[PDB]
């Protein structure tokens, strides 16, 4: 029974790990948006110059 | 996956080895009973002779 309680605690810890990895995913989202904005400004500048 | 399957077959094999070990213990105590009665008969033969 103590082992089962420990397993429940580690499942909660894995949920917390999933939350931290969610924050990692939003960081990936921010860097993706950064790259998209950079390429967008570059291509629109190229199109305007052409 | 393989490891859940292994634990299932291991529970099966653990039960099986439990029954065979119980049978082994019964056989061993029967064998030692045979030994004690054989040695008692030998002692009786020795005392008679």
């Amino acid at each position: 029974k103590n082992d089962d309680i420990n397993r429940e605690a580690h499942q909660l810890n894995e949920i917390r790990k999933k939350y931290t990895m969610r924050k990692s995913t939003i960081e990936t989202l921010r860097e993706k948006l950064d790259q998209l904005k950079r390429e967008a400004r570059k291509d629109v500048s190229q199109k305007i110059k052409d | 996956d393989q490891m859940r399957q292994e634990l299932e077959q291991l529970e099966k094999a653990n039960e099986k080895l439990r029954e065979v070990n119980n049978s082994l213990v019964v056989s061993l105590q029967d064998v030692k009973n045979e030994e004690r009665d054989i040695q008692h008969e030998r002692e009786s033969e020795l005392r008679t002779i």
Partner: protein
């Protein structure tokens, strides 16, 4: 000699059961591990 043989196979059964114990220790070792499928699921949703 028969008793010695049955004791030896008892030793074999005890080794087998202790290996099963190691394997269940491994079982809950791998129960308590981090899973990194969140990026996979989010990326699948993005693709969809």
């Amino acid at each position: 000699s028969r008793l010695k043989e049955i004791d030896g196979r008892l030793k074999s059964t005890k080794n087998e059961m202790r290996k099963t114990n190691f394997r269940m220790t491994e079982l809950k070792m791998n129960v308590g591990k981090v899973v990194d499928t969140g990026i996979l699921n989010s990326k699948i949703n993005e693709r969809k």
